[PDB]
Homo-oligomer: A and B are copies of this chain.
Amino acid sequence: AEIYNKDGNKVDLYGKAVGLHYFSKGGENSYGGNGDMTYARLGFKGETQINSDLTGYGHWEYNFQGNNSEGADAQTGNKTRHAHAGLKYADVGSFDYGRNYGVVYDALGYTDMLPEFGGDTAYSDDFFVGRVGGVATYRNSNFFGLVDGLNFAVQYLGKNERDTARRSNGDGVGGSISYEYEGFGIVGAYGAADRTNLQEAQPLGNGKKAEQWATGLKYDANNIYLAANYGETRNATPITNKFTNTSGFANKTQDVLLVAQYQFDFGLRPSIAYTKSKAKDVEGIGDVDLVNYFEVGATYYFNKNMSTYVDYIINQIDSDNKLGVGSDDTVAVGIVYQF
């Protein structure tokens, strides 16, 4: 909701409240857990007309969790998701710096359209696949105006040496190219980065360099949404050995994402998706599957502000999973207000 629009400066303050609950059995071995998952979000998107050819913009977004008590754990789960400012200039393109999605997410976010879950490979603080701190991203749209619907981007990932091996990264560079023609859109993205010595000093994952590339195809027209993603990572997908409490990254993963959705004119939006990410040559185990499930979901939009949804995950992970990944199903039911 727009709050100020004078001097060619618009500031849209937005947010939402999501009453959410996950249902599972026992949910220690659940895919997505069990219990109250209510949360809220707040943010703003500002845009200012510097001149005829230049425009400045800033974006912030925060996630306040609502499933926590008012005592010791009240702060659990709260996170800054977006924090970046930049300039959009003429037909040259755009540059921004701060916390933002990696360029691999340009192609990876194609199948991240599921009501509650989906995009399991878009980890936060995982180089290029998800939201990361300190990324300079140059994005050019319509290739300088000469070639319509043909966009690309290049990103410089800065060294983020956090105390955690999982949330750390080194210096990197990535890019993506997309092409959106008559309903369709096909994307390729790639990124490489140095690994921190803490990352390298881990039992799982061997290498002095991380790689993430992903390709995507989507159809978005005539009330149909259909997407497909394929990605491979090298020492860049976080894993955890449940049996030995061992962290680290998978030496290699092959990731497949599918989504098919039709939005009814009266509100109901059923969803069919599939997700399978299998690791290869993990230390002590070899090949394992990180995620494998079929999703059946539906969202009912009353209007643009209010909606409810159900998201059913039919977990195809087996109870023989060597990494101790959960094998049980998870059903998510939510009611969402947003502005």
Contact = CB atoms under 8 A, between A and B. Distances in A.
Interface of A: 1-4, 7, 9, 11, 13, 15-19, 21, 35-36, 38-40, 42, 44, 46, 48, 50, 54, 56-60, 62, 64-75, 78-81, 83-87, 96-99, 124-125, 131, 133-134, 158-164, 166-167, 302-306, 335-339
B1 A4 contact: yes
A18 B85 CA distance: 7
B68 A80 contact: yes
B339 A44 contact: yes
B17 A85 contact: yes
A161 B62 CA distance: 25
A75 B73 contact: no
A5 to B, nearest CB: 9
A15 B44 contact: yes
Given A133-B38, A159-B35, A164 B80 contact: no
Contacts of A3: 1, 3-4, 13
Contact of A17 (B4, B58, B67, B160): B58
A85 B21 CA distance: 13
Contacts of A54: 302
A42 B335 CA distance: 22
Nearest to A4: B1
B66 A99 contact: yes
A124 B99 CA distance: 26
29 contacts: A3-B3, A7-B304, A11-B339, A16-B58, A17-B60, A17-B84, A17-B98, A19-B86, A19-B97, A21-B158, A35-B160, A35-B161, A38-B84, A44-B339, A48-B302, A48-B305, A50-B306, A56-B303, A62-B64, A66-B84, A67-B134, A69-B160, A70-B79, A70-B125, A70-B131, A71-B125, A75-B75, A87-B306, A87-B335
Contact of A97 (B38, B72, B304): B38
